[PDB]
């Protein structure tokens, strides 16, 4: 999920853009 | 300011400014 | 802190401390 | 939604919980 790909790893605006509606 | 360790208040700040008017969902489990 | 007016980061950052584990999601429009 | 209960009216413990997961 978006901790194990933002907060434990670098995050990224291709991962956070996976997370907008 | 995305390309970084990002965790709790943090990481929903992000997600607020990227995601704009979308809006967004955070589900840390 | 719930007791206000909240808007935009400040909306944020209150759905975040009240979610705590379970999150939340933000839907403005 | 949020906004009309929370941004433009006032808050409350109760609306927020609406939003959790």
Chains 1, 4 share one sequence.
Do not use: D, M, W
């Not at chain 1, 907060?7 to 996976?18: A, G, H």
């Not at chain 2, 709790?8 to 809006?23: K, M, N, P, Q």
């Amino acid at each position: 999920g978006i901790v194990e790909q933002c907060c434990t790893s670098i995050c990224s605006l291709y991962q956070l853009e996976n997370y907008c509606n | 300011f995305v390309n970084q360790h990002l965790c709790g208040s943090h990481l929903v700040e992000a997600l607020y400014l990227v995601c704009g008017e979308r809006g967004f969902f955070y589900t840390p489990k």
